[PDB]
Design an enzyme around this catalytic site. Structure first.
Site, PDB file in Angstrom:
ATOM      1  N   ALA A   1       0.842  -1.538  -0.112  1.00 47.50           N
ATOM      2  CA  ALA A   1      -0.059   0.228  -0.228  1.00 47.50           C
ATOM      3  C   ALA A   1       0.998   1.171   0.416  1.00 47.50           C
ATOM      4  CB  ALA A   1      -0.719  -0.464   1.265  1.00 47.50           C
TER       5      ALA A   1
ATOM      6  N   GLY B   1       3.537   1.651  -2.235  1.00 47.72           N
ATOM      7  CA  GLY B   1       3.453   2.039  -3.640  1.00 47.72           C
ATOM      8  C   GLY B   1       2.454   3.434  -4.346  1.00 47.72           C
TER       9      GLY B   1
ATOM     10  N   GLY C   1      -0.312   1.244  -4.776  1.00 50.66           N
ATOM     11  CA  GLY C   1      -1.026   0.520  -3.468  1.00 50.66           C
ATOM     12  C   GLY C   1      -2.312   1.638  -3.174  1.00 50.66           C
TER      13      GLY C   1
ATOM     14  N   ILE D   1      -1.622  -8.270  -8.223  1.00 52.76           N
ATOM     15  CA  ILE D   1      -2.324  -7.108  -8.858  1.00 52.76           C
ATOM     16  C   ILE D   1      -1.047  -7.279  -9.606  1.00 52.76           C
ATOM     17  CG2 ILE D   1      -2.003  -4.996  -9.347  1.00 52.76           C
ATOM     18  CD1 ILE D   1      -3.763  -5.123  -6.706  1.00 52.76           C
ATOM     19  N   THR D   2       0.040  -7.630  -8.480  1.00 55.01           N
ATOM     20  CA  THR D   2       2.272  -8.218  -8.626  1.00 55.01           C
ATOM     21  C   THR D   2       1.987  -8.431 -10.590  1.00 55.01           C
ATOM     22  OG1 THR D   2       2.087  -7.487  -6.629  1.00 55.01           O
ATOM     23  CG2 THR D   2       4.316  -8.896  -7.908  1.00 55.01           C
TER      24      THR D   2
ATOM     25  N   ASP E   1      -6.972  -4.180 -18.339  1.00 51.49           N
ATOM     26  CA  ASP E   1      -6.777  -4.344 -19.510  1.00 51.49           C
ATOM     27  C   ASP E   1      -8.644  -3.997 -20.108  1.00 51.49           C
ATOM     28  OD1 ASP E   1      -3.779  -5.048 -20.436  1.00 51.49           O
ATOM     29  OD2 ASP E   1      -4.892  -6.935 -19.961  1.00 51.49           O
TER      30      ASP E   1
ATOM     31  N   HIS F   1      -2.258 -11.173 -19.405  1.00 50.19           N
ATOM     32  CA  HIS F   1      -1.805  -9.769 -19.019  1.00 50.19           C
ATOM     33  C   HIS F   1      -1.104  -9.371 -19.724  1.00 50.19           C
ATOM     34  CE1 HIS F   1      -3.285  -6.647 -17.303  1.00 50.19           C
ATOM     35  NE2 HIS F   1      -2.758  -5.929 -16.069  1.00 50.19           N
TER      36      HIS F   1
ATOM     37  N   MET G   1      -3.927   1.527 -12.934  1.00 53.76           N
ATOM     38  CA  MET G   1      -3.795   0.626 -12.255  1.00 53.76           C
ATOM     39  C   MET G   1      -4.629   0.157 -10.947  1.00 53.76           C
ATOM     40  SD  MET G   1      -2.381  -2.977 -12.532  1.00 53.76           S
ATOM     41  CE  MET G   1      -4.094  -3.128 -11.878  1.00 53.76           C
TER      42      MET G   1
END
Ligand SMILES: [Ag+]
Length: 300
Positions: free
Chosen positions: A8, A10, A13, A106-107, A139, A166, A216
């Site tokens: 969280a 980053g 996050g 998500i990584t 996407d 992805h 994102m």
């Protein structure tokens, strides 16, 4: 209903946490975790926003206090060389503290990190394929933007199904299934290739000084909010996500999912494909399978 955000501090996050704090249903709880010591202050910062969402932040090496009682865990921490270990470490803590939560990875690379996550949870004996998601919503919302731009439609009213994986050629937008919209095959080809390379637009415009963090964050927030709605009993919630299904095309594959109180309620059919989509689907199955095996062998 509690949502934990691992990673969280980053850029992804923090944008994710900002959107969740203001849009999660009233009575929800949000817990932020990251290594950086600023993470408790990110939560205090967000806790000053007047929404009925309780938020607390945690730092250090131990994510347990952020994971206790979590119903949804979103992992945005952390290419393969660096993120593989980060994903395994965090999924291990998830497997010990909230093994019944829905997990959204998500990584990146999602094609591989979801396979790593699955094998880690298998080793802990708590792997549930209805509860592990690769978050591919970025996407989808990019496709919505690009289609509405080309067709003069309102971007909020366009919904493009996107299947496969992805990354790169594994991203397959089903433009043939957008209602009320028709494309020429050169429009399909240029639109598909832009969707598959959209990330490079951001990094080039950032002069190489960053990547897509805000969009994102918005994408992850959309998938996260859809999940919470479905877990709370809302019906008709459908999102594309990268999940382990029947293995008709690959072990993990992104497809429209009806969500429910258990996570995946039904894995919907990808529907009728055009000649272009059928070609692009079969033409990327091998590079998708290698992405998966890369993740499996790292754990096994
Ligand atoms: Ag769940």
């Amino acid at each position: 209903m509690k949502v934990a955000v691992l990673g969280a501090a980053g850029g992804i996050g923090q944008a994710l946490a900002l959107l969740l704090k203001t849009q999660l249903p009233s009575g929800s709880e949000l817990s932020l975790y990251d290594i950086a010591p600023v993470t408790p202050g990110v939560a205090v910062d967000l806790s000053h926003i007047p929404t009925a969402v309780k938020i607390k932040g945690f730092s250090g090496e131990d994510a347990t206090p952020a994971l206790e009682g979590a119903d949804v865990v979103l992992i945005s921490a952390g290419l393969f060389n660096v993120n593989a270990g980060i994903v395994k470490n965090l999924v291990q803590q998830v497997a010990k503290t909230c093994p019944k939560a829905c997990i959204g990875i998500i990584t990146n690379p999602v094609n591989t990190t979801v396979a790593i996550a699955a094998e880690v949870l298998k080793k802990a004996g708590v792997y549930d394929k209805n509860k592990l998601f690769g978050v591919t919503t970025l996407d989808i919302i990019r496709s919505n933007t690009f289609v509405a731009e080309l067709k003069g439609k309102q971007p909020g009213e366009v919904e493009v199904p996107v299947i496969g994986g992805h990354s790169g050629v594994t991203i397959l937008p089903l433009l043939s299934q957008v209602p009320g919209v028709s494309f020429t095959e050169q429009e399909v080809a240029d639109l598909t290739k832009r969707i598959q390379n959209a990330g490079t637009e951001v990094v080039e415009a950032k002069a190489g000084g960053g990547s897509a963090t805000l969009s994102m964050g918005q994408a992850a927030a959309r998938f996260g909010l859809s999940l919470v709605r479905a877990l709370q009993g809302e019906q008709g919630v459908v999102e594309c996500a990268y999940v382990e299904g029947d293995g008709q095309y690959a072990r993990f594959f992104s497809q429209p999912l009806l969500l429910g109180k258990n996570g995946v309620e039904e894995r919907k059919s990808i529907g009728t494909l055009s000649a272009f989509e059928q070609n692009a689907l079969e033409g990327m199955l091998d590079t998708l399978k290698k992405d998966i095996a890369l993740g499996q062998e790292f754990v096994n």
